[PDB]
Design an enzyme around this catalytic site. Sequence first.
Site, PDB file in Angstrom:
ATOM      1  N   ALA B 123      22.948   8.276  56.057  1.00 32.06           N
ATOM      2  CA  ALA B 123      23.782   9.391  56.488  1.00 32.06           C
ATOM      3  C   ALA B 123      25.126   8.915  57.012  1.00 32.06           C
ATOM      4  O   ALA B 123      25.199   8.359  58.105  1.00 32.06           O
ATOM      5  CB  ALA B 123      23.057  10.208  57.546  1.00 32.06           C
ATOM      6  N   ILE B 156      23.581  15.075  53.282  1.00 33.46           N
ATOM      7  CA  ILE B 156      22.680  13.966  53.568  1.00 33.46           C
ATOM      8  C   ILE B 156      21.461  14.077  52.661  1.00 33.46           C
ATOM      9  O   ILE B 156      20.556  14.864  52.926  1.00 33.46           O
ATOM     10  CB  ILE B 156      22.271  13.931  55.033  1.00 33.46           C
ATOM     11  CG1 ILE B 156      23.495  13.977  55.918  1.00 33.46           C
ATOM     12  CG2 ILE B 156      21.560  12.672  55.308  1.00 33.46           C
ATOM     13  CD1 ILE B 156      24.464  12.930  55.589  1.00 33.46           C
ATOM     14  N   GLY B 339      24.898  26.353  19.927  1.00 32.04           N
ATOM     15  CA  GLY B 339      24.451  27.423  20.801  1.00 32.04           C
ATOM     16  C   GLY B 339      23.170  27.112  21.542  1.00 32.04           C
ATOM     17  O   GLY B 339      23.033  27.420  22.724  1.00 32.04           O
ATOM     18  N   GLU B 362      28.900   8.718  46.170  1.00 31.15           N
ATOM     19  CA  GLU B 362      28.963   7.264  46.286  1.00 31.15           C
ATOM     20  C   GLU B 362      30.385   6.728  46.145  1.00 31.15           C
ATOM     21  O   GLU B 362      30.588   5.614  45.681  1.00 31.15           O
ATOM     22  CB  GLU B 362      28.049   6.610  45.255  1.00 31.15           C
ATOM     23  CG  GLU B 362      27.413   5.332  45.657  1.00 31.15           C
ATOM     24  CD  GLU B 362      26.040   5.563  46.191  1.00 31.15           C
ATOM     25  OE1 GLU B 362      25.279   4.597  46.310  1.00 31.15           O
ATOM     26  OE2 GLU B 362      25.701   6.724  46.461  1.00 31.15           O
TER      27      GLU B 362
HETATM   28  C1  LIG Z   1      25.880  33.524  25.232  1.00 32.35           C
HETATM   29  C2  LIG Z   1      25.844  33.626  23.735  1.00 32.35           C
HETATM   30  C3  LIG Z   1      26.085  34.846  23.127  1.00 32.35           C
HETATM   31  C4  LIG Z   1      26.057  34.976  21.748  1.00 32.35           C
HETATM   32  N1  LIG Z   1      26.295  36.213  21.194  1.00 32.35           N
HETATM   33  C5  LIG Z   1      26.272  36.317  19.920  1.00 32.35           C
HETATM   34  C6  LIG Z   1      26.516  37.614  19.344  1.00 32.35           C
HETATM   35  O1  LIG Z   1      26.764  38.639  19.969  1.00 32.35           O
HETATM   36  N2  LIG Z   1      26.465  37.629  17.988  1.00 32.35           N
HETATM   37  C7  LIG Z   1      26.199  36.556  17.182  1.00 32.35           C
HETATM   38  O2  LIG Z   1      26.180  36.718  15.966  1.00 32.35           O
HETATM   39  N3  LIG Z   1      25.969  35.336  17.732  1.00 32.35           N
HETATM   40  C8  LIG Z   1      26.003  35.236  19.019  1.00 32.35           C
HETATM   41  N4  LIG Z   1      25.765  34.021  19.574  1.00 32.35           N
HETATM   42  C9  LIG Z   1      25.487  32.892  18.693  1.00 32.35           C
HETATM   43  C10 LIG Z   1      26.726  32.075  18.373  1.00 32.35           C
HETATM   44  O3  LIG Z   1      27.735  32.916  17.820  1.00 32.35           O
HETATM   45  C11 LIG Z   1      26.379  31.010  17.339  1.00 32.35           C
HETATM   46  O4  LIG Z   1      25.510  30.044  17.911  1.00 32.35           O
HETATM   47  C12 LIG Z   1      27.614  30.292  16.829  1.00 32.35           C
HETATM   48  O5  LIG Z   1      28.253  31.143  15.881  1.00 32.35           O
HETATM   49  C13 LIG Z   1      27.276  28.953  16.219  1.00 32.35           C
HETATM   50  O6  LIG Z   1      25.930  28.996  15.719  1.00 32.35           O
HETATM   51  P1  LIG Z   1      24.899  27.890  16.092  1.00 32.35           P
HETATM   52  O7  LIG Z   1      25.003  27.824  17.612  1.00 32.35           O
HETATM   53  O8  LIG Z   1      23.658  28.139  15.510  1.00 32.35           O
HETATM   54  O9  LIG Z   1      25.511  26.613  15.515  1.00 32.35           O
HETATM   55  P2  LIG Z   1      24.730  25.600  14.594  1.00 32.35           P
HETATM   56  O10 LIG Z   1      25.342  25.664  13.245  1.00 32.35           O
HETATM   57  O11 LIG Z   1      23.301  25.845  14.676  1.00 32.35           O
HETATM   58  O12 LIG Z   1      25.065  24.291  15.155  1.00 32.35           O
HETATM   59  C14 LIG Z   1      25.741  23.297  14.366  1.00 32.35           C
HETATM   60  C15 LIG Z   1      26.510  22.359  15.261  1.00 32.35           C
HETATM   61  O13 LIG Z   1      27.194  21.380  14.466  1.00 32.35           O
HETATM   62  C16 LIG Z   1      28.517  21.797  14.231  1.00 32.35           C
HETATM   63  N5  LIG Z   1      28.651  22.152  12.824  1.00 32.35           N
HETATM   64  C17 LIG Z   1      28.140  23.260  12.213  1.00 32.35           C
HETATM   65  N6  LIG Z   1      28.425  23.350  10.940  1.00 32.35           N
HETATM   66  C18 LIG Z   1      29.191  22.225  10.699  1.00 32.35           C
HETATM   67  C19 LIG Z   1      29.817  21.738   9.540  1.00 32.35           C
HETATM   68  N7  LIG Z   1      29.758  22.344   8.356  1.00 32.35           N
HETATM   69  N8  LIG Z   1      30.510  20.592   9.638  1.00 32.35           N
HETATM   70  C20 LIG Z   1      30.573  19.983  10.819  1.00 32.35           C
HETATM   71  N9  LIG Z   1      30.027  20.345  11.977  1.00 32.35           N
HETATM   72  C21 LIG Z   1      29.344  21.482  11.851  1.00 32.35           C
HETATM   73  C22 LIG Z   1      28.815  22.961  15.178  1.00 32.35           C
HETATM   74  O14 LIG Z   1      29.969  22.679  15.951  1.00 32.35           O
HETATM   75  C23 LIG Z   1      27.605  22.991  16.103  1.00 32.35           C
HETATM   76  O15 LIG Z   1      27.877  22.223  17.263  1.00 32.35           O
HETATM   77  C24 LIG Z   1      25.784  33.856  20.965  1.00 32.35           C
HETATM   78  C25 LIG Z   1      25.539  32.634  21.566  1.00 32.35           C
HETATM   79  C26 LIG Z   1      25.570  32.506  22.948  1.00 32.35           C
HETATM   80  C27 LIG Z   1      25.306  31.174  23.579  1.00 32.35           C
END
Ligand SMILES: Cc1cc2nc3c(=O)[nH]c(=O)nc-3n(C[C@H](O)[C@H](O)[C@H](O)COP(=O)(O)OP(=O)(O)OC[C@H]3O[C@@H](n4cnc5c(N)ncnc54)[C@H](O)[C@@H]3O)c2cc1C
Lengths: 198, 379
Positions: B123, B156, B339, B362
């Site tokens: 502490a 702490i 997502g 730290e």
């Molecule tokens: C709080 C919240 C609210 C949402 N609301 C909605 C909504 O109202 N409607 C809706 O439709 N969706 C909604 N979503 C979903 C969101 O729109 C999708 O997740 C987003 O469009 C991307 O999809 P994914 O996360 O599945 O990405 P994924 O494709 O599953 O993940 C792929 C990952 O690799 C990367 N990647 C993907 N494709 C490629 C590529 N060809 N080349 C290189 N890198 C790539 C991306 O950056 C990502 O990091 C919501 C999500 C959250 C968290």
Amino acid sequence: IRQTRPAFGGNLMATIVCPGSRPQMSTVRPGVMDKAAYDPSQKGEVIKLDATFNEGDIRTKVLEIVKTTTDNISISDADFIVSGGMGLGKPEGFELLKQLADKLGGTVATSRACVDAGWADHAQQVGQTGTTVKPQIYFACGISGAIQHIAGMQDSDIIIAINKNENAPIFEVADYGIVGDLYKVIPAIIEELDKIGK
Amino acid sequence: MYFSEQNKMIRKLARDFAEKELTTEILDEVEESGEFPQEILDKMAKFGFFGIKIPKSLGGSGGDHMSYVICMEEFARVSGVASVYLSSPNSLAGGPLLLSGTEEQIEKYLKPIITGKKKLAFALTEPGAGSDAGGMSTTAVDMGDYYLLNGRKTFITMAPLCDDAVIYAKTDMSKGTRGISAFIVDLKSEGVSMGKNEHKMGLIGCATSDIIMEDVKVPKENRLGEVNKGFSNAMKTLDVGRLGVASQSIGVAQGALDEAIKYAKERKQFGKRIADFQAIAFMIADMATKLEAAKLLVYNAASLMDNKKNATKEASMAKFYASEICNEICAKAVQIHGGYGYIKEYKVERMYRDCRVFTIYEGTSQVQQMVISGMLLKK
Ligand SMILES: Cc1cc2nc3c(=O)[nH]c(=O)nc-3n(C[C@H](O)[C@H](O)[C@H](O)COP(=O)(O)OP(=O)(O)OC[C@H]3O[C@@H](n4cnc5c(N)ncnc54)[C@H](O)[C@@H]3O)c2cc1C
Ligand SMILES: Cc1cc2nc3c(=O)[nH]c(=O)nc-3n(C[C@H](O)[C@H](O)[C@H](O)COP(=O)(O)OP(=O)(O)OC[C@H]3O[C@@H](n4cnc5c(N)ncnc54)[C@H](O)[C@@H]3O)c2cc1C
């Protein structure tokens, strides 16, 4: 007559004068002057006026008059604040400060130490996590003085401190400071309070 | 670096252990109920993880600093809060005892915490004194047969769970950094009171509060070493502690990377799998090379400590660089998960939250830069 008053919320004083105006009149604030000498029983020349009322020459007519006792008052709306911290030891200290706040007409505030101890509720807390106050007076009673508190009352028009240890930071912004145990200092402050007439 | 064959074995142990006892089912319950299971702590001390660098000469385990970092890394990979419960008796509690403590004090205080019976809080931080620990305000007065103290300590770790606590108070208020003594105070005593548990962003399972001291009398027999050396005591403990913090930086990094390439191998988008898109694969690379580069940074610092040369800069670089690029890594791993990496069931979000304090406590990254530059420019 050189009339002086505060305007602009109290940030610009002005001496306003009426040269082409007779008489000269002015509402004067309560408490600025003081009492004169009483009972010389000099004389009197009691003079008469007429009181010649008419057949509806007074359109304002009163139904009821009320005298309330306003006890609810927000720490943000107040004009005078008595705040208490961990220098109370017991939760019952606020009665003292409640006595203090009542002769002034304001509320009791708290610091986090008491809330996280259970002596008060969060509605009362002052600081960055608490609530900001700009009263006309603030009483810093038994509070170490962390910036976490000093932040939310820095602009109080005047800060009065009551701490035991003189090495408490609060005396950095204390306009007036008194070292001691508040349980002794606080009641004595109320004594000389009423003794002049509030 | 190059690992001595016993340290490779220790690596094997801490891996299989942290992996087997810290299951998903448990860790979720720890986040919900901010309470680490006492049964696991006992289980750890029983195999000596509570005593890694303390030697068998005092009834410790006889490992080297590199073994403390190894266990710190391999644990922290799997869970952050475990690491917190690990570094305390190894470094932060067992440090000042190891430097400025008589054999009696070590007999009555250290062996309990190495065996897991007692808990000790380090502490130092006050509300007015953070980075500037020299601007303390807690006082310590000499009454002859005991010391009298009046002050207040924020942030702490583990304190509501601790039985005694090493508290740094100002004895000679004029001497400042030269006038600080260190005392051991039994938290069950008089005057001692705790603040509320602070609701922190991550590293949930270990309570963290204020230690409030109101005219608490402490016997002279519980002072750390010579009077007014305490500050240098606390610093020289803080160096190995900072090695600890960099160690967990490197740990949670390896974890979040492992989840990164795992998810990126398994998830497919547009027909390809994630990892076959050039942006991702390169991103994985980038995280990996930094992580290794700096793993090498920290391994080296600890090896220096083991061969007894001053490691005060090298550790500071290790903590600074390790924690910062840890955060960069953790975030990028979220972004690969996409997502899904924003929902608590995917482990990567717990990591991302844990690894954030790493640059503050730290000694902040700023304090690190102050130390390092101040060490390089004196002529
Ligand atoms: C709080 C919240 C609210 C949402 N609301 C909605 C909504 O109202 N409607 C809706 O439709 N969706 C909604 N979503 C979903 C969101 O729109 C999708 O997740 C987003 O469009 C991307 O999809 P994914 O996360 O599945 O990405 P994924 O494709 O599953 O993940 C792929 C990952 O690799 C990367 N990647 C993907 N494709 C490629 C590529 N060809 N080349 C290189 N890198 C790539 C991306 O950056 C990502 O990091 C919501 C999500 C959250 C968290
Ligand atoms: C995230 C976070 C947010 C916070 N936010 C706030 C905030 O918004 N506001 C806030 O106030 N705090 C806040 N705090 C806490 C703050 O840092 C201090 O802990 C708090 O101010 C301590 O209470 P105190 O100020 O009453 O001083 P304390 O140290 O608790 O009070 C002790 C002082 O009273 C004196 N004293 C003791 N007995 C007596 C007596 N009988 N008569 C007179 N004096 C006596 C002592 O000498 C000492 O000066 C926060 C803390 C955290 C971690």
